[PDB]
Structures are given as C-alpha cells and as structure tokens.
Structure 1
C-alpha cells in the first residue's frame, strides 16, 4: 500500500518535524561538540524551526558578529572562484540576490527575504528545518517547491569546513539555482516522483538528487561547470571538481543511483549533466521504471 504523503503545502507541517536527528544533537567529531555556548545557539535555531508552521513568516534572526565574520570569510573566497567555476545560471542569479536580499560580506541574508524572492521568481519557498529528515520527507517538500533549509551558522573555529549543511551552504549553494526556472522544474519533479513512492524508489531518487542538486557538474559551451550546491559552498572541493584530477562520468540515473553518497570526504566521482532540461528528461524516463 502507498505510504502517507503530503497533498498540499501545509501538510509539510506533519513531516517537516519528523526529525531523525535534531540539529542540536552534534556528532562526536563536530567542531562545536565541546562548545556549550554554540550548543545553546544551535538549540535556539532548532527550536525556531520546530515551532514554525506553514504560513508563518520565517523568524528573522539577529546573527552575532562572530557568525557574520564566518559568513564573510566563506563568502569572500567563494566569490573569487564562482566566475571561473560556476554554471551560467548561477552567475546570472547571484547578483540579483546581492541586490534584493542583502548578500554581502558583512551581512547574512534572512531566510524570509530569500524565500519571498524565490516565490516571485520560480514559486520556490523556504522552510526552516530543525535537523535531518528522512529522504522521503525531505524530497516531499520539493514537490511543493519548498526547500527545507538550515538557519544556523557553522562553528567559527573553521569557516572553511562543515560536516553538515549550514545556512552558508543553503544561501550560497542552493538559493541561486532555485531562482532559475529550468532548475526549479527539475527539482520539483524529483519531489513529485518521490510522493508515495516505494522506499527503494525514494532512495534512488535521493541519490540522483545528491549527484545533481548537491554535487552535479554540467557542460556549457564545451566547458565543465559546477551547479551542485555542496560544491558551490566548499572552497576546496569546488576547485578539485574542475581540477583535472577528479573522476567524471555522464549523468545516467540507472548508473548514478548505484553510487554511494559521501558526506565527510570529496566525492569519488562527479556526474555531468548536459543541461538542466536534459537531466530533467532523463529523470522522467527513469521514474517510469521505478514507480
């Protein structure tokens, strides 16, 4: 029988809080693991997300000077690399975000502002999320053009590394492409495909999502470019991915879905999509075979 799935955007209220691992529950190896002040700050962010209901404005947060410095450090360096590394759609949308959502080195954009911007451009919206969700629940958000988004900032001891998504990853990695209609469509259809799907199918969709939305490369005017959010927010892997020393294969869902998703190291392999339109077409054919 078909498992429960959200049927309208407010139904995400019921699965968004089905958190498998709370945001405040840091793994032994976390840079802030021994920091009780950062631990409290994380509990504050997790509580904001848990209390959030669809329809609410996303609570605005006053970021500390230390958090803003961490953002600025990350921001400053990544921006040096984007012109020579990022896909054209990313480069087109990022200056719009600087203009309308206050992206700059000395300011962390508010999720509410970014959500209102996306709603206008592609109908995407943001939902703050406490911590890790099941792949079923995370992907179901995309069905309604909702991106579940972390609001906290990585620990300041190491601005260039995070074991997990933080809101620097969300704002710099994900948001510029959610503002692109072809990418938004591609993403939504991953979500739509997942709704009520078997566990098996959900896992394969989540792996395809990982190797496009999070670590994807594309070919544009004969060049390899980056569109994966996990690359776009990581100084070291962004450079590595286009370095010439990375393994690279064509995006092909039946093959890609067999690949392991690595969380604490560089990927072993990156997949190249011809275009967002082509990736979308390939997923449509793939979904027929698993659903």
Structure 2
C-alpha cells in the first residue's frame, strides 16, 4: 500500500515537525549555553507554526547580523562571476523588496510573500532535519522548509549544517525563477507516496541539482546549487579547474553518493532548468 503523504498544503503540519533538532557534539556552538537556548527558541517557533500563520518575525542579535554580514560580503564578491544568470537576475529584487543587506537578515515571512507573488513558492520554518520523503513532499505544494537560526559566530564559514544564511542566499533567489520552481515542484510531485527506492533516487537527483548543481550558460559553467551558493570555499572550488564534472543524467546521477562533511567528489552539469526538468520527467516514468 501507498505510505501516508500530504494531499493539501496544510497536511505539511503533520510531518514538518518530525525532526532531528540541535543537541552535534563537535558543533561549534555545542558548549555555548546562550547559543543552545537560542537554538531552542528557533526550534520552538518552527514546532509551533501551523500553516496559515504568518511566519514569526525574529529580532536577530548584533552577533547574528555580523555573522550574516561576513558571509554575505564574501559571497557577493563571487556571485557575478560564479552564479547562473537566473540567480543574478533575482538577487537584486530580493535586496529591494526583502531587505537583503550586509547589515540586515531578511525575515522568512517577507521572503515567503515575495516568492508567493513570483512563483507561488512559500516558506515554512523548520526546526531541524526532516526525512527526504517529508522534505520532498513540501516541494509538491511549492513549500520550501527553511531553517531560521544562524550559524555560531565562532565560525562564520561553517556549512555542513544548513542555517538561514544558506536558505536565504542559496535557495531563495532560484525559487523566485519560474522554470526552477517548476523543476523543484516536479521532484516533490514525483516523490508523493513513492517507494523508498524512488524517494532515495529523487532525493539524490535533488541533491545534485537544487543543492550542488552546475549549469552551462553561453558555453561557460555557472553555479545554481544552493549548497555551493552559500559556501565561499566550495563555490570557488566548483568553478576551478580542479573539480570533476559530469553531465546531469538522472539514471546515472541518482547512484552518486551525497557528501556532507567535505566538498563533493563530483558535480553534475545541467544544460538548463528546462532540460533538467525534461530529463527528470523521462526518469520518473521508470521509477513508477
């Protein structure tokens, strides 16, 4: 029989709270009590959120805003030569309408309203790590589960855990692009009630596009993966000559191991978002 899956956007209330929350022995904020309390604060906001709520606005601390500023300033030096054209198009809109600035962390609620207007995407705050199945299921309704906390200030370059900087600078600009939003939703739609194997394969295809994808644009390689776009060192590494790259090809790509504590071993290059979408459509037919 088919496993439980959401049939409407509010059904995400029943899975979006199935998470692994902070407390991570080697995490940089682990021995910091103020940080632990702060992470609990963010976790509770997510756990108590229900669909239809405005996303609680947060007053970020001076320390949090500086950490954001440090990350934001370095990445912006790189985007013009590293990010795909779609990302560059949308980022200035975010600055103008959502308050993206070195000295200000954008509110998820504002970003959510921006995306609802542009592509029908919306944000739901998430307390911690969701299963691949639950995470993908949100995409079926154009819902992106977003962490709201900030990485520990001791290491502004700590990326193996997604934080709000990753969400806001890595994912959001692409979710505001129609072709990309369609591509993402179709991964979610394919995952709904699918087999475990199918969910694994879709999650890996997602990983090597939405999180670590490269694309070829006017004969040059650019970056569209969120994980690269929020990671100063890997963003540089990926477009350097030292990285190994292969064509995006779902039946091959879905077998590749997804790495978290290190740079990827390989990056997959999609021709365009429209083409990646077509390739997934052919692929999803084979996994039922």
- Scaled by the length of structure 1, the TM-score of the pair is 0.98
CA deviation digits over 1:159-209, x for unaligned, max 9? Answer: 012320000000000000000000000000000000000010001000000
* Aligned with residue 226 of structure 2, among 225, 229, 242: 229
Q: How far has the Cα of 1:20 moved from its partner?
A: 3.9
Note the C-alpha offset of 1:251. 0.4
Answer whether contact 2:125 2:146 (CA < 8 A) is retained: yes
Choose from 47, 53, 57 the match for 1:56.
53
Deviations 1:66-86 (A, max 9, x none): 000000000000000000000
Residue 108 of structure 1 pairs with residue 99 of structure 2: no
Distance (Å, rounded) in 2 between the aligned partners of 1:126 and 1:252: 29
Q: Aligned partners of 1:33 and 1:283: how far apart in 2? A: 40
Q: What per-residue deviation string (whole Å, max 9, x for no partner) do you get for residues 240-273 of structure 1?
A: 0000000000000111011110001000000000
Measure how far apart 1:28 and its partner are: 1.3
Task: Report if aligned partners of 2:183, 2:277 keep a CA contact under 8 Å in 1.
Answer: yes
Q: How far is 1:22 from its partner?
A: 5.1
The CA distance in 1 between the partners of 2:20 and 2:156, in whole Å, is 26
| Contact 1:13–1:54, Cα closer than 8 Å, also in 2 | yes
Contact 1:83–1:91, Cα closer than 8 Å, also in 2: yes
Query: Does the 8 Å contact 2:170/2:230 carry over to 1?
Result: yes
* Alpha-carbon distance, 1:21 to partner: 4.3
- Offset at 1:128? 0.1
Contact 2:212 2:227 in 1 (8 A): yes
8 A Cα contact 2:22 2:39, kept in partner: no
1:128 touches 1:150 (CA, 8 Å); kept in 2? Answer: yes
Cα distance in 2, alignment partners of residues 20 and 39 from structure 1: 15
In the alignment, the residues of structure 2 paired with residue 95 and residue 221 of structure 1 have an alpha-carbon distance, to the nearest angstrom, of 22
Q: 1-side partners of 2:78 and 2:131: how far apart? A: 33
Contact 1:20–1:134 at 8 Å: present in 2 too? no
**The residue matched to 2:15 in structure 1 has which SS?**
helix
Displacement of 1:36 after TM fit? 1.1
Q: Which runs of 4+ in 1 moved over 2 A?
A: 20-23
Structure 2: distance between partners of 1:81 and 1:52: 35
Counterpart in the other structure of 2:95: 98
8 Å CA contact retained: 1:247, 1:268: yes
Report the RMSD for the aligned CA atoms in angstroms.
0.8
Deviations 1:34-91 (A, max 9, x none): 1111011000000000000000000000000000000000000000000000000000
Measured in 1, the distance between the counterparts of 2:78 and 2:160 equals 21
* Counterpart-to-counterpart distance in 1, 2:117 and 2:37: 35
Count of residue correspondences:
288
Task: Return the TM-score normalized by structure 2.
Answer: 0.99
Query: In the TM superposition, what is the alpha-carbon distance from 1:211 to its structure 2 partner?
Result: 0.2
Determine helix, strand or coil for the equivalent of 1:16. Answer: coil
Q: Distance in 1 between matches of 2:234 and 2:153?
A: 20
Pairing of 1:114-263 with structure 2 (within 5 A): 114-263=111-260
